[PDB]
Design an enzyme around this catalytic site. Structure first.
Site, PDB file in Angstrom:
ATOM      1  N   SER A  36      39.904 127.550 -64.377  1.00  0.00           N
ATOM      2  CA  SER A  36      39.382 127.718 -66.010  1.00  0.00           C
ATOM      3  C   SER A  36      39.929 128.819 -66.599  1.00  0.00           C
ATOM      4  CB  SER A  36      37.959 127.560 -65.595  1.00  0.00           C
ATOM      5  OG  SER A  36      37.458 127.211 -66.814  1.00  0.00           O
ATOM      6  N   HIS A  82      34.080 120.277 -63.002  1.00  0.00           N
ATOM      7  CA  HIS A  82      34.874 121.237 -63.651  1.00  0.00           C
ATOM      8  C   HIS A  82      34.968 122.217 -62.400  1.00  0.00           C
ATOM      9  CE1 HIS A  82      36.460 124.043 -66.343  1.00  0.00           C
ATOM     10  NE2 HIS A  82      35.823 125.094 -65.979  1.00  0.00           N
ATOM     11  N   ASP A 137      35.764 116.003 -66.604  1.00  0.00           N
ATOM     12  CA  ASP A 137      35.489 117.555 -66.952  1.00  0.00           C
ATOM     13  C   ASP A 137      34.997 117.775 -68.228  1.00  0.00           C
ATOM     14  OD1 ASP A 137      35.914 120.237 -67.338  1.00  0.00           O
ATOM     15  OD2 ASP A 137      37.328 120.495 -65.957  1.00  0.00           O
TER      16      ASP A 137
HETATM   17  C1  LIG Z   1      36.057 128.347 -67.609  1.00  0.00           C
HETATM   18  O1  LIG Z   1      35.048 128.011 -66.975  1.00  0.00           O
HETATM   19  O2  LIG Z   1      36.529 130.086 -67.179  1.00  0.00           O
HETATM   20  C2  LIG Z   1      36.550 128.049 -68.915  1.00  0.00           C
HETATM   21  C3  LIG Z   1      37.314 129.032 -69.652  1.00  0.00           C
HETATM   22  C4  LIG Z   1      35.917 127.378 -69.684  1.00  0.00           C
HETATM   23  O3  LIG Z   1      34.827 126.886 -68.531  1.00  0.00           O
HETATM   24  C5  LIG Z   1      34.910 128.182 -70.586  1.00  0.00           C
HETATM   25  O4  LIG Z   1      34.915 129.412 -70.484  1.00  0.00           O
END
Ligand SMILES: *C(O)(O)[C@H](C)[C@@H](O)C=O
Length: 268
Positions: free
Chosen positions: A97, A247, A218
């Protein structure tokens, strides 16, 4: 500010052994413990470096300098400081992420250091634009930010199951634990920083080969974003599809994710 101090402050751990060094960098709402289920699949073959982002609930929140960390470059600086303090000249980097964003930036700042990138739950930009689908609108995120301030606990309770995606109660409980561990002001600030970030223009500067891990749904990353990363990342890039959703596949489907990680980290 450090080698030794920074290694302690960010909970740096080095486990396993091998000529192939791999750094595991967690995302929003988690800490390095998110990697616990996939870790045993890597430590026979690799020297694994784990650390906590400064915003993790497992780091003392009084280290979080709101001024300094209002852009992702500050997080990159920490990552590079850690690797330099450990005297690592070359590694593969697995980022989830926000850490996928950090990995991209770090691989551009120091192409000598990053031999390969594995990006999980990755996006170069969350907000929609003229001919770009990020998945989010301005008014939508405004409401999310308000919810985060008005009632952090209620927000986190609602968000955890949506982030995990699949109905995997143990993963929801685990992500909730770390999300509730984050200071609410720091959580909001990280989210604001991420949603202001736009890496589109710099994707072609990445020289490392890249594996983009895509799940079947996701909540924060439209399917079209993986194809965008493949088309625009400057190194040899492939998209690897997991046969499940979410996610946070390292929490919800660690065995499946481990298959991809072993294959991606075989040679670099
Ligand atoms: C992650 O979870 O770090 C991503 C950037 C998004 O989920 C939201 O911050």
């Amino acid at each position: 500010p450090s080698g030794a101090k920074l290694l302690q402050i960010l909970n740096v751990r080095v486990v396993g052994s091998g000529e192939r060094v791999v750094v595991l960098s967690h995302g929003f709402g988690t800490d390095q413990s998110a990697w616990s289920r996939v870790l045993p699949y890597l430590t026979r073959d690799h020297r694994v470096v784990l650390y906590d982002l400064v915003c993790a609930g497992s780091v003392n929140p009084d280290h979080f300098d709101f001024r300094r960390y209002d852009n992702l470059d500050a997080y990159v600086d920490d990552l590079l400081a850690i690797l330099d303090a450990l005297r690592i000249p070359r590694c593969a980097f697995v980022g989830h992420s926000v850490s996928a964003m950090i990995g991209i930036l770090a691989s551009i700042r120091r192409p000598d250091l990053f031999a390969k990138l594995v990006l999980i739950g990755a996006s170069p930009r969350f907000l929609n634009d003229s001919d770009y689908h990020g998945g989010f609108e301005l008014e939508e995120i405004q409401q999310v930010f308000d919810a985060m301030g008005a009632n952090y606990s209620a927000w986190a309770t609602g968000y955890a199951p949506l982030a995990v995606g699949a109905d995997v109660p143990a993963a929801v409980q685990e992500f909730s634990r770390t999300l509730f561990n984050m200071r609410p002001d720091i959580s909001l600030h990280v989210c604001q920083t991420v949603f202001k970030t736009d890496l589109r223009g710099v994707l072609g500067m990445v020289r490392a080969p890249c594996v983009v891990v895509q799940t079947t749904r996701d909540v924060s990353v439209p399917a079209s974003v993986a194809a965008y990363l493949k088309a625009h990342l400057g190194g040899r890039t492939t998209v690897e599809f997991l046969q499940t959703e979410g996610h946070l596949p390292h929490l919800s489907a660690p065995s499946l994710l481990a298959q991809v990680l072993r294959r991606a980290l075989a040679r670099y």
